[PDB]
Amino acid sequence: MKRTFQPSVLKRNRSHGFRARMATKNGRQVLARRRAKGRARLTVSK
Amino acid sequence: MIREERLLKVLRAPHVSEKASTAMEKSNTIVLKVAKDATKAEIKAAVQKLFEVEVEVVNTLVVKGKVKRHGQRIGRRSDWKKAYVTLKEGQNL
Amino acid sequence: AVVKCKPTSPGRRHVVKVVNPELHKGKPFAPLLEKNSKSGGRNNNGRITTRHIGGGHKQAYRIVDFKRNKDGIPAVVERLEYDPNRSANIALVLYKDGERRYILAPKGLKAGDQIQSGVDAAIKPGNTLPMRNIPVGSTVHNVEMKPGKGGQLARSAGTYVQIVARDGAYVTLRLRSGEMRKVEADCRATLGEVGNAEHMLRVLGKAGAARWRGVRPTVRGKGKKTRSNKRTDKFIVRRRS
RNA sequence: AGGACCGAACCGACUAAUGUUGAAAAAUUAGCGGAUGACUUGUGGCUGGGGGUGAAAGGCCAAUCAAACCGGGAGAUAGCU
RNA sequence: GCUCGCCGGAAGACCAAGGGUUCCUGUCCAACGUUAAUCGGGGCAGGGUGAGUCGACCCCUAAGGCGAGGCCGAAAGGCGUAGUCGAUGGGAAACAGGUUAAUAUUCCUGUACUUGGUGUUACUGCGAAGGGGGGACGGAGAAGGCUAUGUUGGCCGGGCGACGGUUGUCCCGGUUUAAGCGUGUAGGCUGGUUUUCCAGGCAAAUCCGGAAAAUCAAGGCUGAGGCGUGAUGACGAGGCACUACGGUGCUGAAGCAACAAAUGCCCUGCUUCCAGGAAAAGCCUCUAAGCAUCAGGUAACAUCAAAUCGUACCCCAAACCGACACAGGUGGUCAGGUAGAGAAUACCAAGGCGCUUGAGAGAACUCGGGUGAAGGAACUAGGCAAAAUGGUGCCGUAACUUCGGGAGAAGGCACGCUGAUAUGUAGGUGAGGUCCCUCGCGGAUGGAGCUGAAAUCAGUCGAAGAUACCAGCUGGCUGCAACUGUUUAUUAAAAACACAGCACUGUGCAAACACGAAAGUGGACGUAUACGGUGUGACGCCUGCCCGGUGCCGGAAGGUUAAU
């Protein structure tokens, strides 16, 4: 049976890309808190 | 465009290998590892004004770095560009 | 003209087809095709606001003029076309000056006929002129409530309005619903009556007809008038009976 | 032409069996319907939770739903273990 | 190195998403491989991806997103103009063979092709964020030709068969060759040439369209394929000389005709059809301000450039998603032979594999099957499971019915090989020549070689002749439902759902209703034969009486009634 997870770079970068996240103020706060925590990779490394 | 410092710095060094030797003995082609950008015009000018040899056509390609993980420590190689230079007239090393 | 298909098999066993041979066959006038195709019946937010709608076969939109601002320029009707957007059929009018446009085809209008607008146009079906010069007691179609728009009333198949009297600057019209309304006389009017009136004869044959016409199936879950305007009461005389 | 029949690819598994700490947190064996359209599918977007969507099961919304996940109110309260 | 077996419309090969070096070489066996692991998709070191002709990229675009101004909302926040992003499509160009352990249409020999700049030759009306020409579009059907492809004849070079015959109507391998150039056929499309004028194409326009006339009815457009060049070339078995046994140099002849044929093309075409089936850019005309010896454009000439990014590896699996080297899922293309209606089924060509624990023992018991004398659902809640027919063509086929169906109803008839009709029948495919002939991508012609269906008789083999796989059991009564279909992914696939039709009710356009605090949006770029809500659910006979009460309509002498 087809699994729930279907990898797609375009979908991933369009739904959780850096620019897409920064576009909305909520994503800006998410990025700020992730930086405060100290995550090695904020959203994704292309 | 010259600016000969750019021509001097564009190319890093020649590459030695069995394929390189076969190319040299077959078509007198030289394989050179060059800088990241290493544009075709820049490498052409550098070869012309550094080796004093005419170049017929220049071909370039990017070689991806390998991985040499040492155990819980992933180490990726750097990125460098390989360029093929054909002279067709220069019988030099 | 209606043809009863034989009961070869269920699903179009009892279909009724409304066919009309004189209608033109082939591609429409391409220069008059634009956007506003099937929108899916979804608002800007994308919520389901008009339930039981969706899908539907692709249909292009043809721009149709109703203002009829072209006055004093007789035009010749070349062919008749079926517009998927609207039940009523349209006709391709070519003006003497070279303008090709589409106008709703009345019942009395056939291929190869002359139509002229303006206040000096002859009183025959297919012409358009202000209702101020329209004799009382003549049926009308594609009536305009306010000048500048063109035919905001009686655009569906087999729709007519009977003029009862003028009674001053305004004019009293009787809508097909059976209500008397007062409309400004300066509005433009179109003589004649709309063409084919066999819309109800067709029974759509089977589910696929409505399914590809853009109507989704209705799922099961009275005498209360919801009219609340309080602005057009003076304009309207009485409601329908 | 036939929302036609017989019947491949393809489409949800209906039927008896296997497995019930399986190869698989739903698959296989042998029959079963459609297979030119109310058909199916790839590629992008849209509908975001007291809402969405739903040919209506109160189905699905990340292997979960008669109200998903995350951090907080909150070490909620508990005449119960 | 050989034998046996499986797939071979895949378990083969090539691409995009997928992972990002697992690909090749030398080296090691701690763990990793469900077992030992010299081997490997395990570790170490080195090498590997060559682009104007692939694609991405890139000018302008659909659905959709952002949004200068502006509107709305206490602020975050919502919609939206111009504008800008956004393919899943639209726009320019390459092939034969070889090459390395790993890369190619990227490198090598050639034919070539698209675009821009630079200067020259001779000529001249050039210049749009604008119009037009086509770009530019749906379902189904088909006939006629060609192509890859496969078969046969000759031909090329080697053979006389481990064993009964095999110098012949016998076997072995081949009989392959691109893009471009001129021919422009088969087929399809269109009626053309010249002049005058015009309320239109946002002002204007030689351009489009319309109105007038004179003339021809032969002119133009599109268009697979084949033909000579391409190509006295590439390939060529098999041989002639040098070998580190891995290999290198040279040679080399046939390489032609007929048949069948595609899902490929002619065809973005022709017929019918209602469900009426997008946009812009790619090329050209003209005009606006301007320039009107200028600057630009026209055909050619010599030259320059066409940056950047992946080019390995699997891509129906050991490498992607399933925690695994997992009996699961993954789009597009290539689609051979035998018989057959086929891309199902049975065996083979090229190619990939025997699937990561083996050998013995040959007990009960468990799982899937082979046969079984007699009965044949009698066991079981239960024809559940199993068992039986299963196709072709001919005869024959009831009730009812909306006349379509029932129906393939039921029930019977023959199915192999050989000769004759007919050394291979009708059809098709079709070489040369007579006559003229624009005189060749011509015909009235006349037969060369081949598929050769289907039918009757005779002879013959066996119990069975569709003898393999594949392949409906048949009929009636009866309740339900218009039929087809849809959900309870993971207990109930229906007697539930809607379904085409019918009935009631509401809506007059700034319509009704919902999303929304609000702009605005869907309804609908629709206009009462239109759309929203509720009930039943084709078709035939009907929907009969009643307003106690609840909503609903029209509203009344009157009693009651807050805010103020």
Q: How far is the CA of A26 from the C1' of E436 (A)?
A: 93
Q: How far is the CA of C12 from the C1' of E115 (A)?
A: 58
Q: Taking CA C63 as the corner, what is the angle to CA C58 and CA C68, rounded to the nearest 5 degrees?
A: 155
> Using CA atoms, how far apart are residues B20 and B33, in angstroms rounded to an integer?
12
* Inter-CA distances, B22 with B14, B17, B34, B79, Å: 14, 9, 20, 25
Chains that touch C (3 or more CB pairs under 8 A): none
Q: Which of C169, C147, C149, C187 is nearest to C161 (CA)?
A: C187
A10: exposed, middle or buried (C-beta count within 10 Å: 0-12, 13-18, 19+)?
exposed
Q: Using DSSP bridges, classify how beta strands C188-190 and C128-130 pair: parallel, antiparallel or unpaired.
A: antiparallel
Closest nucleotide C1' to the C-alpha of B86? E107
Chains that touch A (3 or more CB pairs under 8 A): none
- All domains in chain C, ordered by first residue: 1-113 (2.40.50.140), 117-194 (no CATH), 195-241 (4.10.950.10)
Cβ-based neighbours of C200, under 8 Å, separated by 6 or more: none
C60: exposed, middle or buried (C-beta count within 10 Å: 0-12, 13-18, 19+)?
middle
> Using CA atoms, how far apart are residues B61 and A16, in angstroms rounded to an integer?
32
Name the structure determination technique. Answer: cryo-EM
Give the total number of structural domains in chain B: 1
Does at least one atom of strand E sit less than 7 Å from the CB of C4?
no
Strand E interface, B 29-48, C-beta < 7 A: 29, 31, 39-41
Q: Which of C124, C186, C112 is nearest to C149 (CA)?
A: C186
> Using CA atoms, how far apart are residues C21 and C11, in angstroms rounded to an integer?
25
In three state form, how does the secondary structure of A1-46 look? CCCCCCCCHHHHHHHHCHHHHHHCHHHHHHHHHHHHHCCCCCCCCC
- What is the side-by-side strand order in the sheet with B80-86? B11-14, B29-34, B80-86, B57-63
> Using CA atoms, how far apart are residues C91 and C106, in angstroms rounded to an integer?
9
Give Cα C148 to chain centroid, integer Å: 17
Does at least one atom of strand E sit less than 7 Å from the CB of C177?
yes
Q: What is the resolution of this structure in A?
A: 5.4
Are the beta carbons of C40 and C214 closer than 8 angstroms? no
Q: Is C66 helix (H, G, I), strand (E, B) or coil?
A: coil
Question: What is the span of the domain harbouring residue A34?
Answer: 1-46
At residue C21, what is the residue type? Answer: P
Residue B43: how many CB atoms within 10 A of its CB? Answer: 23
Q: At B11, list the tokens.
A: 């190319």
> Using CA atoms, how far apart are residues C198 and B38, in angstroms rounded to an integer?
76
> Using CA atoms, how far apart are residues A20 and A11, in angstroms rounded to an integer?
12
Are the beta carbons of C139 and C128 closer than 8 angstroms? no
Span between the terminal Cα atoms of chain B, in Å:
28
* CATH, residue A18: 1.10.287.3980
Q: Kindly state the DSSP code that residue C86 receives in the 8-state scheme.
A: S
Q: At A18, list the tokens.
A: 């850096």
Q: How far is the CA of C52 from the C1' of D60 (A)?
A: 20
* CATH, residue B58: 3.30.70.330
Q: How far is the CA of C151 from the C1' of E80 (A)?
A: 29
Question: What is the span of the domain harbouring residue B8?
Answer: 1-93
Task: Provide the greatest CA pair distance for chain B.
Answer: 52
Chain E nucleotides reached by a protein CB under 7 Å: 17-23, 43-51, 62-64, 66, 76-77, 79-80, 100-102, 106-108, 132-133, 136-137, 198-200, 208-211, 272-279, 306-311, 320-322, 328-330, 402-404, 482-484, 497-502, 504-515, 520-539, 551-554
